[PDB]
Amino acid sequence: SVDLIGINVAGAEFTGGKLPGKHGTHYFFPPEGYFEYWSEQGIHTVRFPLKWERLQPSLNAELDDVYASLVDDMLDQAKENDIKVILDVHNYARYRKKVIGTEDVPVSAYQDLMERIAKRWQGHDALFAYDIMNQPYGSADKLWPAAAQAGIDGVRKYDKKRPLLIEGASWSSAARWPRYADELLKLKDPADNMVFSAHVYIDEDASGSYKKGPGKDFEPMIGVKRVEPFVNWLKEHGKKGHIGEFGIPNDDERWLDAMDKLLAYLNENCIPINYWAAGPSWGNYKLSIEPKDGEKRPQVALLKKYAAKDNCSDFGPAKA
Ligand SMILES: OC[C@H]1O[C@@H](O[C@H]2[C@H](O)[C@@H](O)[C@H](O[C@H]3[C@H](O)[C@@H](O)[C@@H](O)O[C@@H]3CO)O[C@@H]2CO)[C@H](O)[C@@H](O)[C@@H]1O
């Protein structure tokens, strides 16, 4: 089933300069009892970032034993707690800072990664979908459509059923989506089960930094206005969509107002969302919705409100 309300659970991609890095010092998977909290809150879909260089520290080589086994245990815990997992290769279309499709990182190496991910986990009941690449941007934008096809081809060698979440150029901007996305119309999925996934932050530059407050001339519909280009493109092209990232600070009613209006518009169009972010090691990170003594998470009440409003059977938007 397709849940409209979900969360990112971040931590396994942390401290990206420390490779392989040490679990519990530089990066963090969910501890025991982690998923039971969110399951109790009524949240049942999780987007889970993974670092490519940790999963596969040499291109074209077998997956890393330590890191892949942590993914195994996370999916086991997800299954135990009725959580559906979207695995996210959280790499900005780059491997050790070089763009997929350059001589350093041929598309065949990215296809190899995706084959190994599907081969290892397509048999796991908690696996829901593959988000094949987080936020291509910059020098990767031009090459990303060709890389995406290689990644699709990779997953489909071993998993011919699950949805593939396909992000776009320019940090998968929902607001700028139609400026670049026409290049993705050439993508071919033999299983015909692709879902496009855009991101939206509502600070001025949409970086999700929220360096400033909302400001005097803040528009509560900014979230809706920034996903409208994406959703309208989906309708125009008969495609299915998804919002893989959106988060706001906890300290201004204007942000929550924009959130509530955004969720209402996504609900009208059966577009799921993954809130950025929960996770086991966020500290006082301004966008965290993980419980923390003395910190209020008003965003989670909005998520729960719209989870009870979820009456969709599949990814929208609906086709006329
Ligand atoms: O969206 C999260 C993602 O944001 C990255 O910052 C990006 C912004 O996404 C992007 O909107 C912004 O685009 C500005 C652009 O730099 C300017 O040329 C001009 O056109 O105004 C645009 C804003 O409307 O650029 C920043 C990068 O500078 C983060 O880097 C990234 O970590 C984050 O995940």
Short mmCIF file of N, CA and C in Angstrom, two decimals, residues 97-230:
data_model
loop_
_atom_site.label_atom_id
_atom_site.label_comp_id
_atom_site.label_asym_id
_atom_site.label_seq_id
_atom_site.Cartn_x
_atom_site.Cartn_y
_atom_site.Cartn_z
N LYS A 97 33.07 12.24 -5.24
CA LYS A 97 33.02 13.62 -5.73
C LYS A 97 33.11 13.74 -7.25
N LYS A 98 33.07 12.63 -7.98
CA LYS A 98 33.12 12.67 -9.43
C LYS A 98 31.78 12.24 -10.00
N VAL A 99 31.34 12.95 -11.05
CA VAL A 99 29.97 12.79 -11.55
C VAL A 99 29.81 11.47 -12.30
N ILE A 100 28.66 10.81 -12.10
CA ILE A 100 28.36 9.59 -12.86
C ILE A 100 28.26 9.93 -14.34
N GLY A 101 29.02 9.21 -15.16
CA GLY A 101 29.11 9.49 -16.58
C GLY A 101 30.42 10.11 -16.99
N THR A 102 31.21 10.61 -16.05
CA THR A 102 32.59 10.96 -16.37
C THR A 102 33.43 9.69 -16.52
N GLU A 103 34.65 9.86 -17.03
CA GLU A 103 35.55 8.72 -17.16
C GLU A 103 35.84 8.09 -15.80
N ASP A 104 35.89 8.90 -14.74
CA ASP A 104 36.14 8.39 -13.40
C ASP A 104 35.04 7.45 -12.93
N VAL A 105 33.79 7.71 -13.33
CA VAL A 105 32.65 6.98 -12.80
C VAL A 105 31.74 6.64 -13.98
N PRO A 106 32.04 5.60 -14.74
CA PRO A 106 31.19 5.27 -15.89
C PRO A 106 29.81 4.83 -15.44
N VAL A 107 28.82 5.04 -16.32
CA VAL A 107 27.45 4.68 -15.96
C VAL A 107 27.36 3.19 -15.65
N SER A 108 28.24 2.37 -16.24
CA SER A 108 28.19 0.94 -15.95
C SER A 108 28.51 0.66 -14.48
N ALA A 109 29.35 1.50 -13.85
CA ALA A 109 29.62 1.32 -12.43
C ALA A 109 28.40 1.67 -11.58
N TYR A 110 27.62 2.67 -11.99
CA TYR A 110 26.40 2.97 -11.26
C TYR A 110 25.37 1.87 -11.49
N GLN A 111 25.31 1.35 -12.71
CA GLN A 111 24.42 0.22 -12.94
C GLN A 111 24.81 -0.95 -12.04
N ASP A 112 26.11 -1.16 -11.85
CA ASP A 112 26.56 -2.28 -11.02
C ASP A 112 26.08 -2.13 -9.58
N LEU A 113 26.23 -0.93 -9.01
CA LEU A 113 25.70 -0.67 -7.67
C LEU A 113 24.23 -1.05 -7.57
N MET A 114 23.43 -0.57 -8.51
CA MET A 114 21.99 -0.76 -8.41
C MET A 114 21.62 -2.24 -8.54
N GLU A 115 22.37 -2.98 -9.37
CA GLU A 115 22.16 -4.42 -9.49
C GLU A 115 22.42 -5.10 -8.15
N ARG A 116 23.49 -4.68 -7.46
CA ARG A 116 23.86 -5.36 -6.23
C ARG A 116 22.88 -5.04 -5.11
N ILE A 117 22.37 -3.80 -5.08
CA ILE A 117 21.34 -3.41 -4.12
C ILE A 117 20.08 -4.23 -4.34
N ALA A 118 19.59 -4.26 -5.58
CA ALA A 118 18.41 -5.08 -5.87
C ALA A 118 18.67 -6.57 -5.61
N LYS A 119 19.84 -7.08 -6.00
CA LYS A 119 20.07 -8.50 -5.79
C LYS A 119 20.02 -8.85 -4.30
N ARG A 120 20.58 -7.99 -3.46
CA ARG A 120 20.66 -8.31 -2.04
C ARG A 120 19.31 -8.17 -1.34
N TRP A 121 18.51 -7.15 -1.70
CA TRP A 121 17.34 -6.82 -0.89
C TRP A 121 15.99 -6.99 -1.58
N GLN A 122 15.94 -7.41 -2.85
CA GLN A 122 14.63 -7.57 -3.48
C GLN A 122 13.78 -8.64 -2.80
N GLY A 123 14.40 -9.53 -2.05
CA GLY A 123 13.65 -10.53 -1.32
C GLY A 123 13.15 -10.12 0.04
N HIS A 124 13.44 -8.90 0.47
CA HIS A 124 13.07 -8.45 1.80
C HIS A 124 11.70 -7.80 1.81
N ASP A 125 10.81 -8.32 2.68
CA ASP A 125 9.44 -7.82 2.74
C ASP A 125 9.38 -6.35 3.13
N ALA A 126 10.32 -5.86 3.94
CA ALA A 126 10.21 -4.46 4.32
C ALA A 126 10.64 -3.50 3.21
N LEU A 127 11.34 -3.97 2.18
CA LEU A 127 11.72 -3.06 1.09
C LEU A 127 10.48 -2.66 0.29
N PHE A 128 10.26 -1.36 0.16
CA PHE A 128 9.11 -0.83 -0.59
C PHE A 128 9.48 -0.29 -1.96
N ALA A 129 10.58 0.44 -2.07
CA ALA A 129 10.94 1.09 -3.32
C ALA A 129 12.41 1.48 -3.28
N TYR A 130 12.94 1.80 -4.46
CA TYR A 130 14.31 2.29 -4.61
C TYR A 130 14.28 3.74 -5.07
N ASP A 131 14.83 4.64 -4.26
CA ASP A 131 15.09 6.03 -4.66
C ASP A 131 16.53 6.01 -5.16
N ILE A 132 16.72 5.99 -6.48
CA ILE A 132 18.00 5.50 -7.01
C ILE A 132 19.15 6.50 -6.86
N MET A 133 18.85 7.77 -6.63
CA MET A 133 19.79 8.88 -6.46
C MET A 133 19.18 10.11 -5.83
N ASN A 134 19.80 10.55 -4.73
CA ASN A 134 19.39 11.77 -4.06
C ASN A 134 20.02 12.98 -4.73
N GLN A 135 19.19 13.97 -5.09
CA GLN A 135 19.60 15.31 -5.50
C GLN A 135 20.81 15.39 -6.43
N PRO A 136 20.71 14.91 -7.67
CA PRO A 136 21.68 15.37 -8.69
C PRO A 136 21.69 16.90 -8.74
N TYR A 137 22.87 17.49 -8.93
CA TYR A 137 22.96 18.95 -9.05
C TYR A 137 24.24 19.34 -9.77
N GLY A 138 24.25 20.59 -10.25
CA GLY A 138 25.48 21.21 -10.75
C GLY A 138 26.00 20.49 -11.98
N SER A 139 27.30 20.16 -11.96
CA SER A 139 27.92 19.50 -13.10
C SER A 139 27.33 18.13 -13.38
N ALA A 140 26.49 17.59 -12.49
CA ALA A 140 25.86 16.31 -12.74
C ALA A 140 24.54 16.42 -13.50
N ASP A 141 23.95 17.61 -13.57
CA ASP A 141 22.62 17.77 -14.15
C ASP A 141 22.56 17.23 -15.58
N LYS A 142 23.50 17.66 -16.43
CA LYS A 142 23.44 17.28 -17.83
C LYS A 142 23.52 15.77 -18.02
N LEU A 143 24.37 15.10 -17.25
CA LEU A 143 24.59 13.67 -17.39
C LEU A 143 23.59 12.82 -16.63
N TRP A 144 22.75 13.42 -15.80
CA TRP A 144 21.91 12.62 -14.92
C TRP A 144 20.90 11.75 -15.67
N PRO A 145 20.18 12.23 -16.70
CA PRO A 145 19.26 11.33 -17.42
C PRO A 145 19.91 10.04 -17.92
N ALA A 146 21.11 10.12 -18.49
CA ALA A 146 21.80 8.90 -18.90
C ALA A 146 22.15 8.03 -17.69
N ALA A 147 22.58 8.64 -16.59
CA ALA A 147 22.88 7.84 -15.40
C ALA A 147 21.62 7.18 -14.85
N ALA A 148 20.50 7.91 -14.85
CA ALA A 148 19.26 7.35 -14.34
C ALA A 148 18.87 6.09 -15.10
N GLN A 149 19.02 6.09 -16.42
CA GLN A 149 18.68 4.91 -17.20
C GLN A 149 19.54 3.71 -16.79
N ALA A 150 20.84 3.93 -16.58
CA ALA A 150 21.70 2.86 -16.11
C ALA A 150 21.25 2.32 -14.76
N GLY A 151 20.83 3.21 -13.86
CA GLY A 151 20.36 2.77 -12.56
C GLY A 151 19.07 1.98 -12.64
N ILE A 152 18.12 2.45 -13.46
CA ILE A 152 16.91 1.69 -13.74
C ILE A 152 17.27 0.29 -14.26
N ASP A 153 18.15 0.24 -15.27
CA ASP A 153 18.54 -1.04 -15.85
C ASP A 153 19.16 -1.95 -14.81
N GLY A 154 19.94 -1.38 -13.90
CA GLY A 154 20.52 -2.14 -12.82
C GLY A 154 19.49 -2.78 -11.92
N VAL A 155 18.59 -1.98 -11.35
CA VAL A 155 17.59 -2.54 -10.44
C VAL A 155 16.77 -3.61 -11.14
N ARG A 156 16.36 -3.34 -12.38
CA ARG A 156 15.43 -4.24 -13.06
C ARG A 156 16.06 -5.58 -13.44
N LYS A 157 17.39 -5.71 -13.40
CA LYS A 157 17.98 -7.03 -13.60
C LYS A 157 17.49 -8.02 -12.55
N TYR A 158 17.22 -7.55 -11.32
CA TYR A 158 16.88 -8.42 -10.21
C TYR A 158 15.54 -8.14 -9.55
N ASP A 159 14.96 -6.95 -9.71
CA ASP A 159 13.66 -6.65 -9.10
C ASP A 159 12.76 -6.06 -10.19
N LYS A 160 11.81 -6.85 -10.68
CA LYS A 160 10.95 -6.38 -11.75
C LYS A 160 9.60 -5.88 -11.27
N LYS A 161 9.42 -5.66 -9.97
CA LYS A 161 8.11 -5.30 -9.45
C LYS A 161 8.07 -3.97 -8.72
N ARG A 162 9.07 -3.67 -7.89
CA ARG A 162 8.96 -2.50 -7.03
C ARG A 162 9.06 -1.17 -7.78
N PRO A 163 8.45 -0.11 -7.23
CA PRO A 163 8.59 1.21 -7.86
C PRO A 163 10.00 1.75 -7.74
N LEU A 164 10.39 2.48 -8.77
CA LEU A 164 11.66 3.18 -8.83
C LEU A 164 11.36 4.66 -8.67
N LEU A 165 11.96 5.28 -7.68
CA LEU A 165 11.77 6.71 -7.46
C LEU A 165 12.89 7.44 -8.18
N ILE A 166 12.51 8.28 -9.12
CA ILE A 166 13.45 8.94 -10.02
C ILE A 166 13.47 10.42 -9.68
N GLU A 167 14.61 10.89 -9.17
CA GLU A 167 14.75 12.31 -8.88
C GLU A 167 15.24 13.05 -10.11
N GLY A 168 15.23 14.38 -10.01
CA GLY A 168 15.58 15.25 -11.11
C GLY A 168 16.80 16.10 -10.81
N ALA A 169 17.25 16.81 -11.85
CA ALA A 169 18.37 17.76 -11.78
C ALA A 169 18.07 18.88 -10.79
N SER A 170 19.11 19.66 -10.49
CA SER A 170 18.95 20.88 -9.68
C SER A 170 18.38 20.54 -8.30
N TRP A 171 19.01 19.57 -7.63
CA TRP A 171 18.62 19.11 -6.30
C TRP A 171 17.18 18.59 -6.29
N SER A 172 16.76 18.00 -7.42
CA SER A 172 15.40 17.52 -7.61
C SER A 172 14.35 18.56 -7.22
N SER A 173 14.64 19.82 -7.53
CA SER A 173 13.75 20.92 -7.19
C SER A 173 12.36 20.70 -7.77
N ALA A 174 11.35 20.70 -6.90
CA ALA A 174 9.97 20.70 -7.40
C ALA A 174 9.66 22.01 -8.12
N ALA A 175 10.16 23.12 -7.57
CA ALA A 175 9.85 24.44 -8.10
C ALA A 175 10.37 24.61 -9.52
N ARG A 176 11.55 24.08 -9.81
CA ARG A 176 12.18 24.22 -11.12
C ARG A 176 11.98 22.98 -11.98
N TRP A 177 11.19 22.03 -11.51
CA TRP A 177 11.11 20.72 -12.15
C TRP A 177 10.91 20.77 -13.67
N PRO A 178 9.91 21.46 -14.22
CA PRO A 178 9.71 21.42 -15.68
C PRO A 178 10.84 22.07 -16.47
N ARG A 179 11.75 22.81 -15.82
CA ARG A 179 12.85 23.39 -16.58
C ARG A 179 13.77 22.32 -17.13
N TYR A 180 13.87 21.17 -16.43
CA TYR A 180 14.82 20.13 -16.80
C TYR A 180 14.19 18.77 -17.08
N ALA A 181 12.99 18.51 -16.56
CA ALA A 181 12.48 17.15 -16.47
C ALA A 181 12.12 16.54 -17.83
N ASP A 182 12.00 17.35 -18.89
CA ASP A 182 11.64 16.77 -20.18
C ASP A 182 12.68 15.76 -20.65
N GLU A 183 13.93 15.90 -20.19
CA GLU A 183 14.96 14.90 -20.47
C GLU A 183 14.65 13.55 -19.82
N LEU A 184 13.86 13.53 -18.75
CA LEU A 184 13.51 12.27 -18.09
C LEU A 184 12.39 11.52 -18.80
N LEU A 185 11.67 12.19 -19.70
CA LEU A 185 10.64 11.51 -20.46
C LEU A 185 11.22 10.42 -21.36
N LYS A 186 12.51 10.48 -21.68
CA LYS A 186 13.09 9.40 -22.48
C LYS A 186 13.41 8.16 -21.66
N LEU A 187 13.35 8.23 -20.33
CA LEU A 187 13.65 7.05 -19.52
C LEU A 187 12.68 5.93 -19.84
N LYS A 188 13.19 4.71 -19.93
CA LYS A 188 12.38 3.53 -20.23
C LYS A 188 12.53 2.52 -19.10
N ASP A 189 11.41 2.17 -18.47
CA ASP A 189 11.38 1.14 -17.43
C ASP A 189 10.64 -0.07 -17.97
N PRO A 190 11.29 -1.22 -18.13
CA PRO A 190 10.58 -2.40 -18.65
C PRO A 190 9.38 -2.80 -17.81
N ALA A 191 9.42 -2.55 -16.50
CA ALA A 191 8.31 -2.87 -15.63
C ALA A 191 7.27 -1.76 -15.59
N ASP A 192 7.55 -0.63 -16.24
CA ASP A 192 6.64 0.52 -16.27
C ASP A 192 6.15 0.88 -14.87
N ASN A 193 7.08 1.02 -13.92
CA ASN A 193 6.70 1.34 -12.57
C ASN A 193 7.68 2.37 -11.99
N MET A 194 7.77 3.54 -12.64
CA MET A 194 8.58 4.66 -12.19
C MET A 194 7.69 5.70 -11.54
N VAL A 195 8.21 6.32 -10.49
CA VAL A 195 7.57 7.44 -9.80
C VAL A 195 8.61 8.54 -9.71
N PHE A 196 8.25 9.75 -10.12
CA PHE A 196 9.20 10.84 -10.05
C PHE A 196 9.12 11.49 -8.68
N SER A 197 10.26 11.91 -8.15
CA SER A 197 10.29 12.37 -6.76
C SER A 197 11.05 13.69 -6.67
N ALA A 198 10.35 14.75 -6.26
CA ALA A 198 10.90 16.09 -6.16
C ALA A 198 11.01 16.49 -4.70
N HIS A 199 11.85 17.49 -4.46
CA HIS A 199 12.09 18.02 -3.12
C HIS A 199 11.62 19.47 -3.01
N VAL A 200 11.20 19.87 -1.81
CA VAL A 200 10.75 21.24 -1.62
C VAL A 200 11.07 21.73 -0.21
N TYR A 201 11.81 22.83 -0.13
CA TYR A 201 12.04 23.58 1.09
C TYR A 201 11.52 24.99 0.86
N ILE A 202 11.12 25.66 1.94
CA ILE A 202 10.38 26.90 1.74
C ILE A 202 11.10 28.09 2.38
N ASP A 203 12.39 27.95 2.68
CA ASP A 203 13.16 29.17 2.86
C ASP A 203 13.40 29.81 1.49
N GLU A 204 13.84 31.07 1.50
CA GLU A 204 13.85 31.86 0.27
C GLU A 204 14.57 31.13 -0.87
N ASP A 205 15.78 30.63 -0.61
CA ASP A 205 16.54 29.98 -1.67
C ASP A 205 16.28 28.49 -1.79
N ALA A 206 15.31 27.96 -1.03
CA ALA A 206 14.88 26.56 -1.11
C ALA A 206 16.00 25.57 -0.79
N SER A 207 17.04 26.02 -0.09
CA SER A 207 18.10 25.13 0.34
C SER A 207 17.76 24.35 1.60
N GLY A 208 16.68 24.69 2.30
CA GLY A 208 16.40 24.06 3.57
C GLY A 208 17.35 24.45 4.69
N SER A 209 18.10 25.54 4.51
CA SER A 209 19.02 26.01 5.54
C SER A 209 18.30 26.79 6.63
N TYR A 210 17.22 27.48 6.26
CA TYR A 210 16.45 28.36 7.15
C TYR A 210 17.36 29.22 8.01
N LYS A 211 18.32 29.87 7.34
CA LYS A 211 19.21 30.79 8.03
C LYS A 211 18.46 31.97 8.61
N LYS A 212 17.34 32.34 8.02
CA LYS A 212 16.52 33.42 8.55
C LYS A 212 15.12 32.89 8.86
N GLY A 213 14.36 33.70 9.62
CA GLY A 213 12.97 33.44 9.82
C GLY A 213 12.18 33.68 8.55
N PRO A 214 10.86 33.47 8.63
CA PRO A 214 10.04 33.60 7.41
C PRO A 214 10.05 34.99 6.79
N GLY A 215 10.15 36.06 7.57
CA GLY A 215 10.18 37.38 6.98
C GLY A 215 8.80 38.02 6.91
N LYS A 216 8.81 39.35 6.73
CA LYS A 216 7.58 40.13 6.77
C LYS A 216 6.62 39.74 5.64
N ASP A 217 7.13 39.62 4.42
CA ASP A 217 6.27 39.35 3.26
C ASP A 217 6.16 37.87 2.94
N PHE A 218 6.12 37.02 3.97
CA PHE A 218 6.02 35.58 3.77
C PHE A 218 4.65 35.20 3.21
N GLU A 219 4.64 34.26 2.27
CA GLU A 219 3.41 33.79 1.65
C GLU A 219 3.12 32.37 2.11
N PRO A 220 2.04 32.14 2.85
CA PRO A 220 1.75 30.77 3.34
C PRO A 220 1.58 29.73 2.25
N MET A 221 1.15 30.12 1.06
CA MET A 221 1.03 29.17 -0.03
C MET A 221 2.35 28.86 -0.74
N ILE A 222 3.50 29.29 -0.20
CA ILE A 222 4.77 29.11 -0.92
C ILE A 222 5.05 27.64 -1.17
N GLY A 223 4.69 26.77 -0.23
CA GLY A 223 4.91 25.35 -0.43
C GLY A 223 4.09 24.81 -1.60
N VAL A 224 2.80 25.15 -1.62
CA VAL A 224 1.94 24.76 -2.74
C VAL A 224 2.49 25.31 -4.05
N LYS A 225 2.82 26.61 -4.05
CA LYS A 225 3.31 27.25 -5.26
C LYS A 225 4.60 26.61 -5.76
N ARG A 226 5.41 26.06 -4.86
CA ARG A 226 6.66 25.45 -5.28
C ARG A 226 6.49 24.01 -5.74
N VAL A 227 5.41 23.31 -5.36
CA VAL A 227 5.18 21.98 -5.91
C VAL A 227 4.24 21.98 -7.10
N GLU A 228 3.44 23.03 -7.28
CA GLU A 228 2.58 23.12 -8.46
C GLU A 228 3.31 22.86 -9.78
N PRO A 229 4.52 23.40 -10.04
CA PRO A 229 5.19 23.11 -11.33
C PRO A 229 5.45 21.63 -11.53
N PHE A 230 5.83 20.95 -10.45
CA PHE A 230 6.04 19.51 -10.45
C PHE A 230 4.73 18.77 -10.70
#
